Design a protein around this ligand. Sequence first.
Ligand SMILES: CN(O)C(=O)C[C@@H](CCCc1ccc(C(F)(F)F)cc1)CP(=O)(O)O
Ligand SMILES: CN(O)C(=O)C[C@@H](CCCc1ccc(C(F)(F)F)cc1)CP(=O)(O)O
Ligand SMILES: [Mn+2]
Ligand SMILES: [Mn+2]
Lengths: 410, 410
Amino acid sequence: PINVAIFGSTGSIGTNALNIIRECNKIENVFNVKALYVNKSVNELYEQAREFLPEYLCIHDKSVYEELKELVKNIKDYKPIILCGDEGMKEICSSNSIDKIVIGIDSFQGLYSTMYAIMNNKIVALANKESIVSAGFFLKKLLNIHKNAKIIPVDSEHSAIFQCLDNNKVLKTKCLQDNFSKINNINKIFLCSSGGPFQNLTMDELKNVTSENALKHPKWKMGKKITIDSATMMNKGLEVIETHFLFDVDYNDIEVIVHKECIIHSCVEFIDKSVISQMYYPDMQIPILYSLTWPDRIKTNLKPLDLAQVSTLTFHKPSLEHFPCIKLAYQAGIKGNFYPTVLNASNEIANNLFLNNKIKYFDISSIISQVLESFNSQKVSENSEDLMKQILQIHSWAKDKATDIYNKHN
Amino acid sequence: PINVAIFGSTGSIGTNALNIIRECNKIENVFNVKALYVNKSVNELYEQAREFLPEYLCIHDKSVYEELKELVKNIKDYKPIILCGDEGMKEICSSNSIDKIVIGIDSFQGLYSTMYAIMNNKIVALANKESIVSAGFFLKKLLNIHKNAKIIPVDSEHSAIFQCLDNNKVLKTKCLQDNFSKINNINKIFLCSSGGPFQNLTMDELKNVTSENALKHPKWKMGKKITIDSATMMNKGLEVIETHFLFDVDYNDIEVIVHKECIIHSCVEFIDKSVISQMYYPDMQIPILYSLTWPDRIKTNLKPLDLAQVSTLTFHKPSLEHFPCIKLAYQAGIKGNFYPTVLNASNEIANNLFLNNKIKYFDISSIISQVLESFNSQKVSENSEDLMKQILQIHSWAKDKATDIYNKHN
Ligand SMILES: CN(O)C(=O)C[C@@H](CCCc1ccc(C(F)(F)F)cc1)CP(=O)(O)O
Ligand SMILES: CN(O)C(=O)C[C@@H](CCCc1ccc(C(F)(F)F)cc1)CP(=O)(O)O
Ligand SMILES: [Mn+2]
Ligand SMILES: [Mn+2]
C-alpha cells in the first residue's frame, strides 16, 4: 500500500486529495492515510480521523490539543499518536512508515514542512508554487544533499508536463536537479493558461477593471489570491519560474499559450520536435492522484474525456502589453539570483492591494517593476541555514519596498 | 551507432527514412545505413548507394542485377555485398551487423521480409498495416517464438499511441504481446483521422464520387491505394484492427475520431482517465525516426510546432452511414478468426475496382460485406507454417470471391 501523509488536510489540496483517495480505495485498497496535519480545525480533523483512521494526528495550535484528544476518544477501535506543533510535524516526517507527503499549506509553513520532508528522504507532493519561486535555490540544495528525497509537482500544468515525460528517463534523475531536461530529452515547454477573465479587454478597459470583475463568476471557483493572479496572468508568470526550476528548462524555451477550454493542461516538445500533451477536464484530482501514484497509474471512476463533445480546442499568444506581469516574471527569472523571490514578495503585496481596491490593474505591474528595479543581486550563501535566512530577509525587504511605493503615491 | 536496413528504400516510407537519417546524421553521427533493398529501381538505388554507402545492396528483380553491379563500380572506395531476390533479403535479415529493419514494402514481400526479420530477432519498424490486419495471428505466434524480436509501429497513429506510453512499462512487454494494454495501464484509444477527401459530402454527392475526386488536389502526397482507403475510411477501419493487434486493446475501447487539422495524431486514455496525446505537423519523418530511436529520442532540425499559428483543433465522430467501411472493419475485428484477413483481401479488390472506375463508392462496402457474409470461420492452425499457408489461402479465396461478385453484377 501507498502510505501517505496529508499536511493541511482541511484545505483545498488536502480535501481533494482525501476525496480521490476515498474514491480510488473503493475500487482497490491502494492508499493508507497514515497522518493528518492541520492548523486549528480540530472538528474537521476529527471527522477526517473518523473516516481515515490515520496512525498520526497533528494539530499545529497547541491550544486545541486537549480538545482533539477528547474528540478522538469517541472513535472506537482507534488509538492514534496525537502530536502538536512543529515538533509533531517533524516526528511525522521522520516516521519510516510514511512514504509520501502532500503539502497543501501556503506561505512559509509550507516551505518549512517541505524542508523537513526532504530532510527525511520522502516523496513530497508539492502544490505551493510560491515556495518553488521564492526558495528554488534552497530546495535544489536540499535535494542535492538528500538524494532519495523527491518533489513531485501537483500544480496542474506542471503535473501535465511531468505526465508527458518518459519514466524510464525520469527515474534516472528527479525534479529540481541540474540536467533534468537533458536526461528527459526536453526541448521546449508549452505552458497552457486559461487566460483569466480579462483576456479580450482593451488597454483602456484594463485601466479600470476592479477586483470584483476578476472575482465575478469564476470558470473554476478558487481562492482570491490565485484568482487575482489568474486575472493579471502573474499566475502563469510564477508558473514559468516554477517550470524553469522543476524541469531545468531555459526561459527562452518556455512559451505561455492561452487555451481557454482548459482541456490540454500543458505540452512538452522533445528534441526531435515531437510534442506530447496531457488532457482532461479541469479537475485537480488527476494531478493530485498522479503525484501519489507516480511512477504508476491506478483505476479511477472519473468521467471519461469526450473529445467529440468537447469539439474545439483553441490556442493564442498572450499579449505582454495587456498582461505585463508575464513579462516581469520572465525578466526576473532570466535575471536569476533572488529576483524571483522579489517578484513573488512584491506581487503578494500588489495582489492584496488590488484585491482591497487600493490600486488599479496596471499599478500591480508598476509596483512589482519598481521593486525589481530597486533590488541588487546578492552573493548566494553556501550555508543552507544562511541561505534560508537570506531568502526570508529578501522576501521581507521586497514586501516592505512594495508597501513603501504604495504609501508614497497614496 | 544505430545500424539500419531499409526495405523498399525508394518508396514513400523508405525515402522519408533516408531523409530523416540524413538530416539527423548532420547533427550527430547516429545511424549507419547498412542495407538498402528495392524491387527494380536500379538507378535510384545506385544514387542512394553513392550517398549512404551501405554494406549490402539488394534488388528483387534479377533482370537489373548485372546493371546494378556495373553502376556501383563508379563509386569510389566501395565494395558492397550485392544481392538479389528473396534470398538476398534473407541474408540481410540474418546479418549480425544489422540491428533494425524498416519495412517499407506493400503486398506479400512486406509480410515475407517482416517474417524473416522477426525470425532473426531484429527490431522491425513496420509501416505495412495490411500485414498486421491480415496476418496478426501469425505475427503474434512468431513473436512468441522469437522472443527478442520487436515490432515497432511506423503507421503515424500507432506511432503516436506508442509515443504516449511510458517506456518504463513498454520495456516490460512489446507490441503484439498479450497483456500489452494491461501492463501499460491503457484504458481506451482515440484513433485520429483526417476524415479523407469525402468527409463533408452529402449522401447524394457520395453516390456519384469517383476515384478522380479522391486523387485530385490532395491535402498531402500519398499512394493511390491508401488515398482510396482514406476516402472510404477503410484506412481507419484497417487501423482499428491494427490497434487491437498491436496494443491488445478491446474493440469497444477504440474510438475513431475525425481531426481534420492532422496535428493530434492519436490519444491514449489511461485507467485513471488521464489522456496523453502526441502532436506534430503531418510529417511522416517523426514516426519513422521514433521507430529507429525508441526508447530514446534524438535531435532533429524539423520545424517546431507553432500551436498559436495552428490556432484551432477540431474533433467529430464519423458517420457510419457515409463511411460503412468503418462499421465493416469493427464487425470483422469483433468476429475475429480470419475475418480481418477476409476484410483486407476483399477491400484490396474493391479498392482497385473503384480506383479503375469499375464500381461506385457504395459498391465498395457492398462487395466487402458480401465476402464477409460468405466466409466460414476455420480452426486456427497451431503450427506457424500451417498458419501462414492458411492465411494465404483465405486471402486468395477472398480476393477471388470479391472478383466473382463483381463479375456476376457486371
Ligand atoms: C488549475 N491551476 O493549476 C491553476 O493554476 C489555475 C489556472 C487554471 C484555471 C482553470 C483550471 C482549473 C483546474 C484545472 C485542473 F483541475 F485540471 F487542475 C485546470 C484548469 C488559472 P490560469 O491558467 O489562468 O493561470
Ligand atoms: C498518415 N497516415 O498514417 C495515414 O494513415 C493517412 C491518413 C492521414 C493523412 C494526412 C497525414 C499525413 C501524414 C501524417 C503524419 F505526418 F503524421 F504521418 C499525418 C496525417 C489518412 P486518414 O486519417 O484519413 O485515414
Ligand atoms: Mn497552475
Ligand atoms: Mn495511418
